Symmetry: C2
Subunit: 495 residues, 2 copies
């Protein structure tokens, strides 16, 4: 909320190479200042050369602009015309100083950011001194530095949740924490890794049944075709999805070995055989740099399937889904139950189409979920419009400023947490907009905007919710569920 | 030309005539204990003991015989001449420092405190050293083959599948994205394996974890040598967003992720991605005891992806870095383990002969556990080992090397011992496993029958149903 004009200040010089040629130089700058540097900006808002002088090889000038026709774009418009002044009538760009004045209400603490020489507060905003050459300006690095600095200006000026639908409350006769109940009765045990669980037969039958319910009650009637998305995700995929914009604190990073040469690894082996300890420090030195991380969001890697491609109109809506593996996230410390794991199992659902087709597809899923949760699971739940899954996993909060782009969360209560217990999110549906098509460069034959959507069904969360509300004895389950399950298997009884 | 074994230590006790009587004593019977005559075990606040010896009743099991009688430790020298054969490579091994490579053998020089022989470090180093030395002193052999069939499809199925829109390469090394058509085939095998093998034989589905930590591999024995082909996993050193703003801001400004900087900010590896699949299951039964009413435990998993760093090159689905497997695991007594083994072979035979109708063979190979921890050859227990299923890929030619698509292993007591699973009666438990590699099944079937349903066996088509269409582009 500061009205200070966003402004760019370039001080540069050009470098075939005479000295006295200034007639057209004067006449070009005016024919730029009131014509060439106009195009793009609204009336009286284009760029301007404000002063200039000369050398024997070089031609220095000061250049100014606001948000339209920016100096680092304006200067290449100039070199173009200035190249057709002293071509047949009678080589590069250097930068003396680059300054951006950005509007801001609050001070902002200086950080290790590349291409920034200095930064300090001024009247109504912040002034940056950039350390940039011509290569950088073609790359549009000043533009990207401005997007960053604004993101952070928003962040300082500062979570979203608001109701859409709720179920009439139900009597809750099972009041214990399902993970404790399942451990006590042989359904599961803890995995070796953090936030990890080994599912015995009883627990596994629950997951499989939930899975089966999604296939028969949602995925088939709606026309979804199974795919197999990969589970090792690379920077390439996260750059295009946008997760490379800040997912870093929550991923499990993967590093391949630098080589299979077993002589290179001989030293690791030996340590272990002598000490019976694994030398993790030594391994860290022998492993490659990370190539990415374990599946975090599940859809991102599907999009390599359609990257760089065009889709015929006959071929949309593309409705696919994946159930081929585990997702991994580094959650908050503290031991939890299945309601907050690090290794989880999700059925990722994805659709591409037009703005309209996408919403219709989203509506259809909402319909089939309500049938399942009301009629088959018979659980107590609700849904709310929330901060988008793509926004959150990329560091940022708030909502998206397109009416219908965002995430709808499904939440259920857990009777063991008491009347004031925070409810648990267990299902989502998101309209992603044009984000994923744009990012992976996926075009549409007839040339309209491609939109996408996605929904993830966390099995561990369905289980937390269904078991907290119904217990583990089948007799008390909805009989519609009890049909799906068949006969419950026996656990592995220990002594 | 060879030599002997001698140990040599220089050490002082930190705690005259009566002491002078023990020279005659110790060298007569006290230290000629666990060693025949002569070999048993020189120079005399601060005493100082120099002592040579042989292989038996070692110097460090002899300075504690002194610790005892001296009622009536700090080391500054410890050398081990070793009967080595030839000139050998220079190795850095924890408790060693010098590794002199002489003409008659190899001399080593350790560095130990008193609280280093109590745990027997020279034991392990020698064991290792001798285990290595004999370096300069896979197994395969046929059990059964099906007779030849004609091979009307002569094309690389992966090349076919890409041309025909079944799949494309994913972003990572040896990695694939399966389109609808290819996904269906996988699911069809799954349903074959379930309905024809798993359900009939009474296996219950469990979900095994997929991020494996060193403790698992330490117990399972892969921590002895699996390193060259693990995909290592590293958590963040912290979730503090302030600790990552430098990474994020680097990307946002430059459009390149800073992988060197990231490697610095991530923690030491906690372990690796799923490699053999079965190891992590054993944490479910570790330290436990089973009533005999429970054996055989017959269990399986199909909850996700295994990852190995395969040999370099462009390969099709027949050699990938990310794969989908069904891990089948049984525990019981020797006899029960051998019986399940045989039940599966019988059920695979039905599948391969008269559902898929392929040309295949089975051979006795190197145990998978041995291969994956650096070893080769065979197991010394005659009934312990791996049976390997192979099939010809016609596109490879008449001389083509057959592809491994299936195994069945009898692991002996290895896993019950490593993870410490007893049986209530105290008979030794044994285990077995079988890995069903779906891309491998998918490479054989398709290389033998093609991508056109018209020519697949009726039994298969029946189970496939009507093929999904692919996703097409311009
Ligand atoms: Cl992801
Ligand atoms: Cl493993
Ligand atoms: Zn998604
Ligand atoms: Zn196995």
């Amino acid at each position: 909320g500061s009205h200070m004009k966003l402004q760019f200040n370039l001080k540069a010089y050009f470098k075939a190479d005479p000295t006295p040629a200034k007639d057209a130089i004067a006449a070009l700058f005016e024919e730029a200042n009131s014509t060439l540097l106009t195009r793009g900006a609204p009336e009286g808002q284009g760029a301007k050369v404000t002063e200039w002088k000369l050398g024997e090889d070089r031609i220095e000038l000061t250049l100014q602009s606001g948000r339209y026709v920016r100096v680092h774009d304006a200067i290449f418009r100039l070199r173009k015309q200035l190249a057709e002044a002293l071509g047949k009538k009678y080589r590069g760009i250097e930068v003396e100083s680059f300054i951006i004045k950005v509007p801001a209400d609050h001070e902002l603490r200086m950080l290790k950011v590349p291409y920034i020489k200095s930064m300090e507060n001024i009247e109504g905003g912040i002034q940056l001194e950039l350390e940039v050459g011509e290569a950088e300006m073609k790359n549009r690095v000043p533009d990207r530095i401005l997007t960053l600095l604004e993101e952070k200006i928003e962040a300082a000026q500062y979570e979203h949740w608001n109701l859409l639908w709720q179920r009439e409350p139900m009597e809750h006769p099972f009041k214990e924490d399902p993970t404790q109940a399942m451990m006590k009765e042989g359904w599961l045990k803890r995995g070796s890794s953090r936030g990890q669980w080994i599912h015995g037969p009883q627990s596994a039958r629950i997951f499989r049944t939930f899975e089966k319910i999604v296939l028969e009650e949602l995925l088939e009637p709606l026309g979804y075709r199974e795919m197999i998305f990969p589970k090792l995700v690379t920077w390439e995929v996260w750059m295009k999805s946008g997760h490379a914009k800040g997912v870093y604190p929550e991923i499990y990073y993967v590093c391949p070995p630098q080589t299979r040469d077993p002589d290179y690894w001989e030293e690791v082996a030996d340590y272990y055989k002598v000490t019976h300890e694994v030398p993790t420090k030594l391994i860290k030195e022998k492993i490659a740099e990370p190539i990415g991380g374990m599946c975090y969001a599940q859809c991102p890697p599907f999009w390599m399937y359609v990257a760089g491609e065009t889709l015929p109109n006959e071929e949309i809506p593309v409705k696919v889904f994946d159930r081929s593996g585990t997702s991994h996230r580094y959650e908050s410390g503290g031991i939890h139950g299945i309601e907050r794991v690090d290794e989880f199992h999700r059925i990722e659902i994805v659709w591409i189409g037009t703005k309209e087709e996408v919403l219709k597809c989203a509506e259809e899923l909402h319909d089939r979920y309500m049938h399942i949760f009301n009629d088959i699971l018979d659980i107590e739940w609700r849904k709310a419009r929330v901060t988008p899954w793509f926004m959150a996993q990329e560091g940022l909060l708030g909502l998206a400023e397109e009416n219908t782009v965002g995430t709808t969360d499904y939440e259920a209560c857990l009777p063991y947490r008491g009347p004031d217990g925070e409810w648990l999110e267990f299902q989502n549906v998101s309209i992603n907009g044009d984000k994923y098509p744009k990012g992976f460069n996926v075009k549409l034959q007839s040339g309209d905007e491609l939109w996408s959507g996605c929904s993830g069904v966390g099995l561990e969360r369905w289980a937390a919710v269904f078991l907290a509300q119904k217990g583990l004895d089948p007799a008390n389950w909805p009989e519609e569920f009890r049909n799906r399950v068949g006969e419950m298997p026996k656990g592995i009884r220990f002594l």
